[PDB]
């Protein structure tokens, strides 16, 4: 103050799954 | 009226143009994976066809050998 | 033993192990949480890029790739709970953003989700001005915040009131420090063109120096000299000190004389 | 600390079943559909897609059709969304003829929920939204042929009951769902297949998206991108004409009453007015009465 | 051009249909021969 002069593991599992699916899908968009 | 006909014509032209232009773009690996998968599907299906044909021919041959 | 008779392959195997540890795949499948490991690994790879001069491009590339993994994983969320657990971890105890800016992950803090959370906490108490039309109303609000005596009286006499809760919001502290700086410049200019003003300027610069004292006391001297604007601020306040002490010495001498 | 899906890989028989259903080994799955112990959910894979899910993943129409005749499958809505995403019209049409989908399950929570929680693709998104995102035209025609109009997103400053309830305790997802609805409404497909005329709707939508980009400071890049895409749709549709009548009905609508160009310059559609066809019409009206000087040699005679 | 991949896919499916029809006609001929052989006995 300057006036004057558990849930964690489940969230992480969900995000990691999302990231893996996203990367696997994006690898298909690249060139041949 | 004329308005609806003109709009129908232009919309049809635009849809055909977009569908044709989507083919000019670069290739997606999903298409090669899909072609590969359909090739393997065809392989399995033709193997099953050859197997059923061999079974039918064997049944006919067993019948012909038992008739004699 | 692998340094002697085995040189130039020890550095190569080291860079290979660091290239493998820094892949998105291994970082996403090995550890419990990837975010903290990735940030700390990025900082370690940067430090080793600075230490070992050769192959600097390679370590730079690896640590940039790790920054990009972190930013992507943060971007892929869709809920409030997720962005909160990412930005903080197990809004009290806002730590992972602090470590992110300490390790200098540029694109991490500048993401629209992080920015959204920061602008929700930034206008914390007063929402009627967050949705304000233009910056002209904000200028009007600062001009009306130029009324300091009301604020000081209400703060030290009876806190926890409506105005006591308003002052406990970050935008207020910011605009109040800006107003103090502005009125200091104003007093300077008024004193410029044609005794009380002199002492007021002296008290203001003494307050600035006490603020800087409370500032550099919090951390070690190295953290104090770390920034560059603090050096200029310190030099400026000390110059004011020296000038006013010279004026006071001259005043005392002439007073004794004509006395 | 490697995260997993099941406790342990239980069955080798059904593992082989799943791995043959992945590569489309239709004699194996056909022989095994009727004689096996159980056609369970077989998500032993690291990510956990059901045999139906996995089969749809790789365009196996025979496998999908043989599985839809089992009446004991889950993840159906999820497989439909996935197939819309890829763009395989055969599979989507085959899934739409599955029982239970006769209750108008589109825009009329327990469904789509794969992995017992956290369904992919933004839990506020219906099939038509994904279909408009992925530019699939036949899919849009299919869905709209069964109804399910997209929903209009509410006003930003509106303090209605539902908007207020979803503002408190639901913040940062209200803005996200709003930007999602605006992303879906602004696709070339939906704009070309939904309304009577796309031109007027597109222009006014571009102006509305620009105003909302100016109001809401965050995500400014996204609203800018959307409205630019809509400008480009308008310019393309205008360019695709080939007759005088068409360019007249586009530029004016139902040269007295030259309005749509006026609204275009009022909404600031740069590339619309600067098109060679628009420019041609403007230089035909500009030298209206005297033509002997329109074809003049140089500016010295002017 | 994606048209080439779509065209290759279409020719693959054409080949699939044609070979299925060939297997069907072959099975019909074998069944006719088997019915003749079973009626001769």
From Swiss-Prot, chain B:
Tissue-level expression: Expressed predominantly in brain and at much lower levels in ovary, colon, small intestine, lung, prostate, placenta and testis.
Record localization: Cell membrane
Binding site for Ca(2+) 3: 26, 29, 31
Binding-site residues, Ca(2+) 1: 38
Segments of this protein annotated with the region Binds to IP3R3: 5-25
Domain topic, free-text comment: The cytoplasmic portion of the protein is required for channel assembly and gating.
Family as reported in the entry's similarity comment: Belongs to the transient receptor (TC 1.A.4) family. STrpC subfamily. TRPC3 sub-subfamily.
Subunit structure: Homotetramer. Interacts with ITPR1. Interacts with ITPR3. Interacts with MX1. Interacts with RNF24. Interacts with JPH2; the interaction is involved in maintaining Ca(2+) homeostasis in skeletal muscle and is mediated by JPH2 'Ser-165' phosphorylation.
Annotated disease: Spinocerebellar ataxia 41: A form of spinocerebellar ataxia, a clinically and genetically heterogeneous group of cerebellar disorders. Patients show progressive incoordination of gait and often poor coordination of hands, speech and eye movements, due to degeneration of the cerebellum with variable involvement of the brainstem and spinal cord.
Function per UniProt: Forms a receptor-activated non-selective calcium permeant cation channel.
The protein, known as: Short transient receptor potential channel 3
Organism name: Homo sapiens
Included stretch of the parent chain: 846 to 913 of 921
């Amino acid at each position: 103050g300057k006036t004057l002069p558990t849930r964690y593991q489940q969230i992480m599992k969900r995000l990691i799954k999302r990231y893996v699916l996203k990367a696997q899908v994006d690898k298909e968009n690249d060139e041949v | 009226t004329r308005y609806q006909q003109i709009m129908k014509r232009l919309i049809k032209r635009y849809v055909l143009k977009a569908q044709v232009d989507k083919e000019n773009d670069e290739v997606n690996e999903g298409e090669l994976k899909e072609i590969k998968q359909d090739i393997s599907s065809l392989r399995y299906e033709l193997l099953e066809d050859k197997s059923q044909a061999t079974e039918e021919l064997a049944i006919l041959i067993h019948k012909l050998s038992e008739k004699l | 033993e692998k340094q002697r008779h085995d040189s130039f392959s020890h550095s190569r195997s080291r860079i290979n192990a660091y290239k493998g540890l820094a892949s998105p795949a291994y970082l996403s499948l090995s550890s419990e949480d990837p975010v903290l490991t990735a940030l700390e690994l990025s900082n370690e790879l940067a430090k080793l890029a600075n230490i070992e001069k050769e192959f600097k491009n390679d370590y730079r590339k690896l640590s940039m790739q790790c920054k990009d993994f972190v930013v992507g994983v943060l971007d892929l969320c869709r809920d409030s709970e997720e962005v909160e657990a990412i930005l903080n971890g197990d809004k009290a105890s806002l730590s992972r953003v602090k470590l992110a800016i300490k390790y200098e992950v540029k694109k991490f803090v500048a993401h629209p989700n992080c920015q959204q959370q920061l602008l929700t906490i930034w206008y914390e108490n007063l929402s009627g001005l967050r949705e304000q039309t233009i910056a002209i109303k904000c200028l009007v609000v600062l001009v009306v915040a130029l009324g300091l005596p009301f604020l000081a009286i209400g703060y030290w006499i009876a806190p926890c009131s409506r105005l006591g809760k308003i002052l406990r919001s970050p935008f207020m502290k910011f605009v109040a420090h800006a107003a103090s700086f502005i009125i200091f410049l104003g007093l300077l200019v008024f004193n410029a063109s044609d005794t009380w003003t002199e002492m007021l300027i002296m008290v203001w610069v003494l307050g600035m120096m006490w603020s800087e004292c409370k500032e550099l006391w919090l951390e070690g001297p190295r953290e104090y000299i770390l920034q560059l604007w603090n050096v200029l601020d310190f030099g400026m306040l000390s110059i004011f000190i020296a000038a006013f002490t010279a004026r006071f010495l001259a005043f005392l001498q002439a007073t004794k004389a004509q006395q | 600390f490697m995260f997993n899906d099941r406790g342990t890989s239980l069955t080798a028989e059904e593992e082989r079943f799943l791995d043959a259903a992945e590569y489309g080994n239709i004699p194996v799955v056909r022989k095994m559909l009727e004689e096996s112990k159980t056609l369970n959910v077989n998500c032993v894979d690291y990510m956990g897609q059901n045999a139906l899910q996995l089969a749809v993943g790789n365009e196996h129409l025979e496998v999908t059709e043989l599985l839809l005749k089992k009446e004991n499958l889950a993840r159906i809505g999820d497989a439909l969304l996935l197939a819309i995403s890829k763009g395989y019209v055969r599979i989507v049409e085959a899934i739409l003829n599955h029982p239970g989908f006769a209750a108008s399950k589109r825009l009329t929570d327990d469904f789509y929920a794969y992995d017992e929680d956290g369904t992919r693709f933004s839990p506020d998104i219906t099939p038509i939204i994904l279909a408009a995102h992925c530019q699939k035209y036949e899919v849009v025609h299919m869905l709209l042929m069964k109804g399910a109009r997209i929903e209009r997103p509410h006003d930003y400053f509106c303090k209605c009951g539902d908007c207020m309830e979803k503002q408190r305790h639901d913040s940062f997802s209200h803005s996200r769902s709003r930007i999602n609805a605006y992303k879906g409404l602004a696709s070339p497909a939906y704009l070309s297949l939904s309304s009577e005329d796309p031109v007027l709707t597109a222009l006014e939508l571009s102006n509305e998206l620009a105003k909302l980009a100016n109001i809401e400071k965050e995500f400014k890049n996204d609203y800018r991108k959307l409205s630019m895409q809509c400008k480009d749709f308008v310019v393309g549709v205008l360019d695709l004409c080939r007759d005088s009548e068409e360019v007249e009905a586009i530029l004016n609508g139902d040269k007295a009453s030259l309005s749509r160009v006026k609204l275009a310059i009022k909404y600031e559609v740069k590339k619309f007015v600067a098109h060679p066809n628009c420019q041609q019409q403007l230089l035909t009206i500009w030298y209206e009465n005297l033509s002997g000087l329109r074809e003049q040699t140089i500016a010295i005679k002017c």
